[PDB]
Amino acid sequence: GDCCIIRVSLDVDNGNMYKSILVTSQDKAPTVIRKAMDKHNLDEDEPEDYELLQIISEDHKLKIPENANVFYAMNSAANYDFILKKR
Amino acid sequence: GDCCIIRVSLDVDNGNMYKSILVTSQDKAPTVIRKAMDKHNLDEDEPEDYELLQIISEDHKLKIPENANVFYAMNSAANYDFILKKR
Where do the domains of chain B lie? Predict the structure, then answer.
């Protein structure tokens, strides 16, 4: 079935360190945050502590809604670069 | 970037054995066919001896052109079921 491979960094003071993950057509925001937290060894806590944002440009980050399908809520015309932001 | 998880079987000894491959936007037929033949253990022949072959419906099959990007040459509106065939 359908997929996309995205880049996820932590929310950090200037840009920086992306870890790649596989997003299926079925993946909602908490599963993709759990995958992104595993790529960064976040036994420094829970998927509820975290929101996900897409980097549209320097002046725009796109907020992924709490239980949304990531594959269809993302802007797939923009670059696949995301923040794992600790809310 | 974008991708699909595709499963491939053989045209040969009549019981349907699937193997999954991850196909990216950049993947060409002979390279995904290479992966499929290694996954089925096809070791007498070269990747040029073989075509792919998406099952569009019963009575209907799609030939992926020999040097084409599988991701954009396949029927994305259909079953992600492929068989590997001689010629």
Answer: 1-87
